[PDB]
């Protein structure tokens, strides 16, 4: 009655063996895990990164938040230091329940969550911090540069310091050499009572890992990637705003919804309590949306392992239907890849093999194909050099890089393969195939990652 929670996440407690290697670990829980899309991992008992900072010379520009259920929010992007934040959330925790904050039951806080956001008469706001490590306000995690103490060396090559992360060799968005900031740096937030992230899944359909360095709990609900349409259905019917089309990337828009609706209508979700020194991680194409307990603090990152590669030309290929941008090209971090096959992990060349010979069926139908609606005229293009913004369907948004067709007529302007009828009026005999790479230049690429692989 009013709020039944979901039943729990799954919780894993791994070994100092288990713990050592994060890839290794991640893909041994990952059938398990994949069934709930999200779950929670206890490191061992005596892995603790050191935190320290000074509140007072951390400055951060605040967002601020309407808490209304259904109600259309964008996603991502006066001044508080990490004292008077702090002062400022706990004096309002402790006013909102006329209570001391610790003793504020973690039950209650959710159940009042669920009635204040659905509640029309009250209006609550509160604010929060989110941004990408930088000079004014860096990692929780130990880096270099200042003199170090012994225990922080010990964490400053550990695989789950979240700046390393991104940039070891399990990893395959390490090689891209894009500028995508938003992708492969740590993101920092500060949590107050009530402070809210909407349901959303990841770009590019990724993993995410979040760690809570310090503070009150943060609480999550949580659906495994096999049901993501059914919820996309269920949001559409109760808030169809929230899909209409956008110009952009920085216009994304999503929503609170109470998990006991997605239930009602046999969506499976799950719950947990993240606390302080404790990780959870996100599946690809996982939905997961929360909310913060109190005063808190935390860091997490974008990550892409072997298993996810074909879900990420499957995404791709779903944002081309959507006319979704996407944040970088698919096909562009393969073949950069496979021109570094001699220095790639066996098990990574192994499976980019796999993903290169799709690509090269996949392309050799789509070059065929516009052979024959008259396109007969060529020229080598290398579309890496191109700003995104420049190599972008103008009917479909995506980013090309395998192939692309020009027209004399639309100086700059480009389609991908499957939009040549959107271009222009002109005849095909007047538009232009530009490609990246011949078939015969695609075939050695591949055998490269063959003999890597063995
Ligand atoms: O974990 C949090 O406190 C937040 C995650 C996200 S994503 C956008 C704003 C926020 S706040
Ligand atoms: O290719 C697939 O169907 C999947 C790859 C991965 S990696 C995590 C969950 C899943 S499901
Ligand atoms: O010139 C052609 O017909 C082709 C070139 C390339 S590159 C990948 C597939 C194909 S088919
Ligand atoms: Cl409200
Ligand atoms: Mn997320
Ligand atoms: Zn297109
Ligand atoms: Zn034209």
């Not at 004399?408 to 499957?418: A, D, I, Y």
Request: hydrophobic share 40%.
């Amino acid at each position: 009655s009013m709020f039944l929670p979901p039943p729990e996440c799954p919780v894993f407690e791994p070994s100092w063996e288990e713990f050592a290697d994060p890839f290794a670990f991640i893909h041994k829980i990952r059938p398990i895990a994949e069934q709930t899309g999200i779950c929670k991992v206890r490191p061992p008992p005596d892995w603790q990164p050191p935190f320290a900072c000074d509140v007072d010379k951390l400055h951060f520009t605040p967002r601020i938040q309407r808490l209304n259920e259904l109600e259309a929010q964008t996603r991502v992007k006066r001044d508080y230091t990490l004292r008077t934040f702090g002062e400022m959330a706990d004096a309002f925790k402790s006013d909102y329940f006329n209570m001391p904050v610790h003793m504020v039951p973690t039950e209650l806080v959710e159940k009042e969550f669920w009635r204040l956001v659905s509640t029309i008469e009250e209006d609550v706001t509160v604010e929060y911090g989110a941004d990408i490590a930088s000079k004014e306000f860096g990692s929780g995690f130990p880096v270099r540069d200042i003199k170090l103490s012994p225990e922080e060396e010990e964490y400053l090559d550990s695989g789950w310091n979240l700046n390393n992360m991104p940039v070891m060799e399990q990893s395959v968005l390490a090689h891209i050499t894009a500028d995508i900031c938003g992708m492969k740096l740590p993101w920092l937030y500060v949590g107050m009572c009530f402070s809210s992230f909407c349901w959303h899944i990841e770009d590019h359909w990724s993993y995410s890992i979040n760690y809570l360095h310090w503070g009150e709990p943060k609480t999550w609900y949580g659906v495994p990637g096999y049901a993501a349409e059914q919820l996309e259905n269920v949001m559409k019917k109760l808030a169809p705003e929230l899909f209409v089309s956008q110009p952009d990337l920085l216009h994304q828009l999503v929503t609170i919804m109470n998990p006991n609706t997605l239930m009602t209508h046999e969506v499976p979700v799950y719950r947990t309590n993240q606390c302080a020194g404790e990780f959870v991680i996100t599946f690809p194409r996982a939905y997961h949306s929360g909310f913060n307990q109190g005063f808190n603090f935390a860091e997490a990152v974008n990550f892409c392992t072997v298993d996810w590669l074909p879900l990420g030309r499957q995404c791709v290929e779903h944002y081309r239907l959507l006319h979704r941008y996407c944040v970088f090209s698919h096909d562009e971090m393969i073949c950069k890849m496979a021109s570094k096959a001699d220095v790639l992990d066996v098990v990574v060349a192994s499976t980019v093999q796999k993903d290169m010979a799709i690509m090269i069926e996949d392309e050799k139908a789509l070059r065929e194909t516009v052979r024959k609606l008259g396109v007969i005229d060529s020229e080598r293009m290398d579309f890496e050099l191109l700003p995104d913004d420049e190599r972008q369907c103008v009917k479909c948004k995506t980013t090309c890089f395998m192939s692309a067709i020009s027209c004399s007529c639309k100086p700059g302007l480009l389609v991908c393969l499957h939009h040549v009828k959107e271009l222009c009026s002109c005849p095909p005999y007047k538009y232009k195939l530009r490609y990246r790479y011949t078939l015969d230049d695609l075939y050695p690429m591949m055998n490269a990652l063959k003999l890597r692989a063995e």
